[PDB]
Amino acid sequence: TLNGGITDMLTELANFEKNVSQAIHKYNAYRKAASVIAKYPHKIKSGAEAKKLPGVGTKIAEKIDEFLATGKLRKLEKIRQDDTSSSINFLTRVSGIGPSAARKFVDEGIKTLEDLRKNEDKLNHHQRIGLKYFGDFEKRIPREEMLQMQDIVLNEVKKVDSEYIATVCGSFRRGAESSGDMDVLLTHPSFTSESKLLHQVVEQLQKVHFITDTLSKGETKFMGVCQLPSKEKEYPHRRIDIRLIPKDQYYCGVLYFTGSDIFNKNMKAHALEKGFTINEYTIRPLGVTGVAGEPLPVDSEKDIFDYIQWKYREPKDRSE
DNA sequence: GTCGG
DNA sequence: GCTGATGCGC
DNA sequence: CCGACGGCGCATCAGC
Numbered sequence: 001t002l003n004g005g006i007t008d009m010l011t012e013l014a015n016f017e018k019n020v021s022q023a024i025h026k027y028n029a030y031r032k033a034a035s036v037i038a039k040y041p042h043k044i045k046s047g048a049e050a051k052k053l054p055g056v057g058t059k060i061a062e063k064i065d066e067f068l069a070t071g072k073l074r075k076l077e078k079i080r081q082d083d084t085s086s087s088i089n090f091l092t093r094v095s096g097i098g099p100s101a102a103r104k105f106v107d108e109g110i111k112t113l114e115d116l117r118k119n120e121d122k123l124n125h126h127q128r129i130g131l132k133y134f135g136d137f138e139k140r141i142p143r144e145e146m147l148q149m150q151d152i153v154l155n156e157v158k159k160v161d162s163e164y165i166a167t168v169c170g171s172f173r174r175g176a177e178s179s180g181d182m183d184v185l186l187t188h189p190s191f192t193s194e195s196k197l198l199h200q201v202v203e204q205l206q207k208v209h210f211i212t213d214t215l216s217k218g219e220t221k222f223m224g225v226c227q228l229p230s231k232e233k234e235y236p237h238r239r240i241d242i243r244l245i246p247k248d249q250y251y252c253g254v255l256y257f258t259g260s261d262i263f264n265k266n267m268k269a270h271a272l273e274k275g276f277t278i279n280e281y282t283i284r285p286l287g288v289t290g291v292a293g294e295p296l297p298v299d300s301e302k303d304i305f306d307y308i309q310w311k312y313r314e315p316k317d318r319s320e
Numbered sequence: 321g322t323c324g325g
Numbered sequence: 326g327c328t329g330a331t332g333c334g335c
Numbered sequence: 336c337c338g339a340c341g342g343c344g345c346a347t348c349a350g351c
């Protein structure tokens with residue numbers, strides 16, 4: 001991109017903190033820095049130039065000073081050569097293996113994809129599936145195939161009950177040309193905030209062999225593996241997430257699920273300021289005393305915007 | 321790690 | 326066996 | 336200077 005070099009650096013440091021240091025807030029800091037610099041209209045000639053930006057503090061300015069001067073970062077090269085930090089990092093690339101388990105595996109001597117193979121017995125179902133499709137889960141999904149996948153899920157859903165509304169959200173709804181996975185928001189007239197619709201839909205998607213494995217399943221959330229039908233050669237296996245939301249709560253749901261995650265954090269933060277609390281369900285009033293007010297009436301994504309005083313931004317403009 | 325309080 | 330911590334992920 | 340830093344769903348297993 002533009003400052004890609006800098007943002008790649010910050011992103012690699014973020015991962016290290018989350019995975020090796022288990023310092024989630026420094027993970028978040030580094031991604032906020034990366035976020036702000038990514039949307040900066042000029043070419044960063046210096047660390048000080050960057051330090052003008054909110055989220056970019058003293059330490060990052062130095063690192064950026066070094067990066068621009070040296071073209072690399074000693075902190076990072078130190079990290080790539082530390083066997084342990086390198087091993088822990090790689091392992092978290094398996095779905096279902098986080099910092100804690102990656103760290104445990106390494107202290108046990110399990111530190112490569114082959115070692116996980118030998119040790120399948122020590123992995124939970126989710127991890128086993130993470131290994132099974134390790135390579136495929138790292139492949140991006142070209143929009144074209146997204147549109148295919150969409151047609152398959154919308155049709156199958158309609159073919160369980162026509163009152164279902166399924167909306168593909170996430171980077172797809174933001175307009176990305178390739179996505180990491182597919183995210184589907186599901187609604188139905190019989191399920192509101194007042195009121196087993198997800199199983200029905202998951203079962204149907206299984207019987208046409210679109211959904212190939214399950215990572216988790218609940219009253220409202222399904223995380224699993226899917227695959228476009230082949231002919232020719234097989235498509236890679238893809239992650240799919242389905243989320244059942246109550247009808248009258250569809251607009252918060254789809255604002256949430258559309259993201260991005262950084263946008264969601266920034267919005268949810270800049271609202272608590274305006275005296276509101278936005279979660280994936282409602283946008284409640286923040287009372288003076290200390291408790292959240294009742295759910296405010298919503299009929300649009302814009303309503304949530306209007307509610308806190310943020311001039312609208314199309315899904316395509318929420319990619320932070 | 322950063323920035324408002 | 327049950328369940329609250331904890332982990333992983335959206 | 337210090338400390339808060341968005342909000343929530345499901346699965347697992349240590350410790351009774």
Ligand SMILES: Nc1ccn([C@H]2C[C@H](O)[C@@H](COP(=O)(O)C(F)(F)P(=O)(O)OP(=O)(O)O)O2)c(=O)n1
Binds near residue numbers: 169181259264
């Ligand atoms: N920490 C998080 C993570 C996610 N989300 C919401 C906001 C997201 O829009 C939505 C999907 O998260 P996703 O895990 O599929 C994602 F982020 F990767 P996506 O944006 O979809 O881009 P892609 O999948 O191509 O990589 O959950 C959130 O609110 N908080």
Ligand SMILES: [Mn+2]
Binds near residue numbers: 170171180183
């Ligand atoms: Mn996604």
Ligand SMILES: [Mn+2]
Binds near residue numbers: 182
């Ligand atoms: Mn997803």
Ligand code: NA
Binds near residue numbers: 051
């Ligand atoms: Na700054």
Ligand code: NA
Binds near residue numbers: 091092093095096098
């Ligand atoms: Na992982």
